Design a protein around this nucleic acid. Structure first.
Ligand SMILES: [Mg+2]
Ligand SMILES: [Mg+2]
Ligand SMILES: [Mg+2]
Ligand SMILES: [Mg+2]
Ligand SMILES: [Mg+2]
Ligand SMILES: [Mg+2]
Ligand SMILES: [Mg+2]
Ligand SMILES: [Mg+2]
Ligand SMILES: [Mg+2]
Ligand SMILES: [Mg+2]
Lengths: 122, 37, 175, 215
RNA sequence: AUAUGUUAAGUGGAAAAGGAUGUGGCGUUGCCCAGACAACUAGGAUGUUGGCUUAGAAGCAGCCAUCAUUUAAAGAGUGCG
RNA sequence: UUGGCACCUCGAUGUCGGCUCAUCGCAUCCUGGGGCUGUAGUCGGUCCCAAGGGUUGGGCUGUUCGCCCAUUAAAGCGGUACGCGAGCUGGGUUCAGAACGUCGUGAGACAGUUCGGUCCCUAUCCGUCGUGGGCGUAGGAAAUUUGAGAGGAGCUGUCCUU
RNA sequence: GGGAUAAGUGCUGAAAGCAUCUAAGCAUGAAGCCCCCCUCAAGAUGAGAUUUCCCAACUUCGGUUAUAAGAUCCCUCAAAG
C-alpha cells in the first residue's frame, strides 16, 4: 500500500535519497501501489551531484514495499522499508547501481534492466 | 449532411425530395446532402 | 401513369396464373408469388395481362403503376433471369466460392461469408468479378447490396467492392 | 442440467498444478433424492424437485421440525423415500432424465465444471447506513456532530417527500444471493463432498444450491 | 344527426424569420396530332481559337469578334471539361 | 445571469460556501453508432442519433469562482427554496470588544480592512428504511412453485497478435 | 446473445414513361429500447398452480360441546434476532 504523499527511500544512485509520491499512475481513482507499479514523484532529499536534484518531478517504479505481495502458490514476501528506483520513461532506470533486494514480481513487468543491475532477487 | 431550416439547391444538379416527412436535397457531390431540421 | 397505360407486359412460354387477390408467375425458372393490391384489377384477354385502376385518385394512380412493375418484373426474371455483376478493386482482394456460399478476402483480419439463399447462385469469374443471378429483381438487388456493405468503394484509391458500371467518385488526397 | 443440494461445512485450501494455492469451500452434498417430477402438461413448467437431508419419521407427540408431519410423510412416500428437511426445485435440468426416487449422487459434477451456488446471506441484524450501504461517514473532528448518520434524505420542497430506494438503515439480513462462475475442483465420492473454488454465501451448516452455470 | 367539402399532422391538442411542396380552390398565360413533355439512342460538326490569344489554354487566365456553313439541322463550340 | 415589477410570507419562509446523501434534464465531457471534410494513414474538424453507465487527486483563496501541479477514456453543463443545517460544520457575513486607512467639529460612519466572537428541539401526521399482528383469498392444513409486476445491474483502460 | 429501432445506409418501385430509400413493399443499422442476467414478488381483492395430509356430532344445527390434520403457549437454544 503506497498512496499519495508517502516517503520512499530511493534504491539506486540516480541522485535521490528520498522521494514522495504525487499520483499512482495507472487508472483513474487508483489509490495504492505495490511492487511493479510505476509512480510519479518528487525528490525531497537528493544527493549533491548525480542526475536528479531536489524538486524534480520524476517517474519511478516501486521495489520492495513494507506490505509486500502475495504469490500464486500462496507465498508471501515482506520488507523492512519502502524503496524505489527512478526510471527513464521506457521502463529503464537512471542509475547503474541499484541497491538492496528487489522482489521477483517485476520480472514480468518488463523491468529486466532493473533486475540485472540489482542484488539477489527474492 | 447539413441539417438546416433552409434547405436549398446549391448547384443546378441538386434535386429536392421528401423522404419520410422531411425535406431533403440529393446531389452528385455529397457536400450538398441536406435534410431539414 | 404512363407506365400504367403501357400495361401490356407481354408474356412468353411463361404462363402467368392469377389467384384472385394475388398472382403467381411460373416458367422455365419459376414460382414467384406476390400479394399485389386490392383496388387494381386484372384481365388476361387473349395472351397478355392488363392492370386497370378505378376512380383516378392519387392513391389509385400511384399504386397502379407500381402494380404494372410488379407484374412485369415477376414475368421477366422468370423469362430471362436477373443478373447484377459486382467487381473487386484492390491489391490482393480474392473472392472465391466455398461451394454454395461465397467467401471474400477484402483486407480484413477475417474472411467474410455471404451465405446464399434460394433462387440465387453466386459465380466468380477470375477472383475479382462476382455475378449474382436469380429470378426476382428485389432479392438479387438485396444480396447484391450486402456484398458491398462488406467493403464499399473508397475515394482515394478506388479499393472496395464495386458494381459493374459504377462511377466511383474519386478524390486526389496526397500526403 | 446438473443441480444438487448440500450444506456448507466450512473452508479450506488445496494445492493444484504448479503448486498454486486455491481456496475451497467444502459442501457436503449428501443423500439427495429426486422427489417429484413436474411436467408442463400438469403445471406449466418442467422441473424436478430434490429433497436433501432426511429427517426422522412421523411421531405422534412431535414438538419440533426434525420429526416429519403427515403431509411430508405422504409426499415423500409417493417416491420410495425418507422425509427430507430441505426441498428445492431445479428447472435447468432435463426432465426426461431423473426418475422419481433417484439418489442424485455427488458424481454428477466433474472437476472443472462451472457452476452457480445459491444461498442465503449471513444476516447481521439492524445495521446503519454506513454499514448496510457503503456510505462515507462524516468527519470525526473539526467540530462535527455528523459521523455515522445517513446524510440528507431529499431535496427541499420540490419533492416534498422522500423518494423510495433512499438507502436508510434497517436489517442487513440473510437474503438469497448467487455467486456465479465458480469451479468444481475436487469431488470426493466416498465422503460425498464437493470442493468449490472460493466462498459461497451463508453460515456454516447452511444450505447451498449448486447448479451449472447459465452463462 | 343530416348535407357539402377540407386536412393525414394526432394537425386538431402552444410560436417566428425563413425553408420548401403537400394537396385544395380560383385564375391568367404559352406550348401541341404540322404529333409535344419526358425519356429515347442516333448529327454534334468545321474554317477555328478567331482575336487580347492566356503558364502552352485550341467550350475557360481575360478582351470575347463570336462570321460563313460539313449541313434537313448545332455553336469563330450549348456545355461537362 | 444581472436586472425590472412588488404578487405570497415581517404574531419569522432563518444563514454564503463546504460536508453527507442525492435526484432530474440533454443544449453530450468520455464511451456507442452515423454524414460531410480543404478525411492518405495516424490524428482531427464539423454535424446528426443517443442520458446506458462513467465523469480524479492535490496547491493557493472563507471563497462560489479562478489559477496551478499531477493524472484520466473523460475530468460535461444545468435544474431540484443559487437541492439538502428539526442531516453536520460556521471559514464567509449584520451583533456587542479593539485597531488602521478614510470621512466627520463631534457623537460616529464606511460596506475599506484587521483580531476576537453561544448553531435550540424527547418525531404527532405524511413520506421513507426495516419488521410484526389482524382479516380476506367459499373446507382446513403442510410443502414446493408460476410471475402479473417492481427493483438491481449496465463503466472502461492497457498490452499482444492480425 | 436475441428481437424491435434511432441517426444513417439501402433494394425494388411508381405516382411523374425518366429518375427516385417510400408512397405500396423489402432490408440493414447503437453502450440506447425490449428480453436475455440478478433479486423481490398471488393483499396479482383477478387473492394463481402442483403435491401430500385431515373429514362431527349434538343439533330452533341457532349455536354449543369437543376436536382432526395442524399449530401454539411454555421450556432448552443460535446458523436468527
Ligand atoms: Mg443558408
Ligand atoms: Mg470521507
Ligand atoms: Mg431541511
Ligand atoms: Mg399538439
Ligand atoms: Mg400595486
Ligand atoms: Mg440530443
Ligand atoms: Mg425543515
Ligand atoms: Mg464596535
Ligand atoms: Mg479629523
Ligand atoms: Mg478565542
Amino acid at each position: 500500500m503506497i498512496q499519495q504523499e508517502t516517503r520512499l527511500k530511493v534504491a539506486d544512485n540516480s541522485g535521490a535519497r528520498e522521494v514522495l509520491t504525487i499520483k499512482v499512475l495507472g487508472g483513474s481513482g487508483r489509490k495504492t501501489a505495490n511492487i511493479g507499479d510505476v509512480i510519479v514523484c518528487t525528490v525531497k532529499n537528493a544527493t549533491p551531484g548525480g542526475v536528479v536534484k531536489k524538486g524534480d518531478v520524476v517517474k519511478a517504479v516501486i521495489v520492495r514495499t513494507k506490505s509486500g505481495v502475495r504469490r500464486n502458490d500462496g507465498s508471501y514476501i515482506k520488507f523492512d522499508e519502502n524503496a524505489c528506483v527512478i526510471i527513464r520513461d521506457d521502463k529503464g532506470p537512471r542509475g547503474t547501481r541499484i541497491f538492496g533486494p528487489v522482489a521477483r514480481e517485476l520480472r514480468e513487468g518488463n523491468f529486466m534492466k532493473i533486475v540485472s543491475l540489482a542484488p539477489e532477487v527474492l | 449532411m447539413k441539417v438546416r431550416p433552409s434547405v436549398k439547391p446549391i448547384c443546378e444538379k441538386c434535386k429536392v425530395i421528401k423522404r419520410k416527412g422531411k425535406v431533403m436535397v440529393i446531389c452528385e457531390n455529397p457536400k450538398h446532402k441536406q435534410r431539414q431540421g | 401513369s404512363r407506365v400504367g397505360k403501357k400495361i401490356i407486359d407481354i408474356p412468353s412460354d411463361v404462363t402467368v396464373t392469377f389467384d384472385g387477390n394475388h398472382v403467381t408467375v411460373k416458367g422455365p425458372k419459376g414460382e414467384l408469388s406476390r400479394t399485389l393490391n386490392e383496388r387494381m384489377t386484372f384481365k388476361q384477354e387473349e395472351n397478355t395481362i392488363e392492370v386497370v385502376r378505378p376512380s383516378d385518385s392519387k392513391e389509385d394512380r400511384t399504386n397502379h403503376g407500381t402494380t404494372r412493375a410488379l407484374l412485369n418484373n415477376m414475368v421477366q426474371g422468370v423469362s430471362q433471369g436477373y443478373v447484377k455483376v459486382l467487381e473487386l478493386v484492390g491489391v490482393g482482394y480474392r473472392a472465391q466460392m466455398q461451394g454454395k456460399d461465397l467467401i471474400l478476402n477484402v483486407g480484413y483480419s477475417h474472411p467474410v461469408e455471404i451465405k446464399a439463399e434460394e433462387n440465387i447462385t453466386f459465380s466468380v469469374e477470375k477472383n475479382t468479378v462476382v455475378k449474382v443471378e436469380g429470378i426476382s429483381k428485389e432479392q438479387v438487388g438485396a444480396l447484391a447490396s450486402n456484398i458491398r456493405s462488406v467493403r464499399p468503394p473508397e475515394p482515394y484509391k478506388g479499393k472496395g467492392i464495386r458494381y459493374q458500371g459504377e462511377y466511383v467518385r474519386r478524390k486526389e488526397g496526397k500526403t | 442440467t446438473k443441480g444438487i443440494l448440500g450444506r456448507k461445512i466450512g473452508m479450506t485450501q488445496v494445492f493444484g498444478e504448479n503448486g498454486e494455492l486455491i481456496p475451497v469451500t467444502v459442501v457436503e452434498a449428501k443423500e439427495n433424492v429426486v422427489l417429484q417430477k413436474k411436467t408442463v402438461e400438469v403445471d406449466g413448467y418442467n422441473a424436478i424437485q430434490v429433497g436433501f437431508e432426511d429427517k426422522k419419521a412421523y411421531k405422534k407427540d412431535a414438538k419440533s421440525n426434525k420429526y416429519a408431519n403427515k403431509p411430508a410423510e405422504g409426499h415423500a412416500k409417493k417416491a420410495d423415500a425418507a422425509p427430507k428437511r430441505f426441498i428445492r426445485e431445479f428447472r435447468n435440468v432435463d426432465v426426461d432424465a431423473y426418475e422419481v426416487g433417484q439418489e442424485v449422487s455427488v458424481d454428477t459434477f466433474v472437476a472443472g465444471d462451472v457452476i452457480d451456488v445459491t444461498g442465503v446471506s449471513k444476516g447481521k441484524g439492524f445495521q446503519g447506513a454506513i454499514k448496510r450501504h457503503g456510505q462515507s461517514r462524516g468527519p470525526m473532528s473539526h467540530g462535527s456532530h455528523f459521523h455515522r448518520a445517513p446524510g440528507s434524505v431529499g431535496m427541499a420542497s420540490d419533492a416534498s417527500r422522500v423518494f423510495k430506494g433512499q438507502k436508510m438503515p434497517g436489517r442487513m439480513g440473510g437474503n438469497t444471493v448467487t455467486v456465479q462462475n465458480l469451479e468444481v475442483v475436487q469431488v470426493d465420492t466416498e465422503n460425498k463432498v464437493i470442493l468449490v473454488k472460493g466462498n459461497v454465501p451463508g453460515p456454516k451448516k447452511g444450505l447451498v444450491e449448486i447448479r451449472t452455470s447459465i452463462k
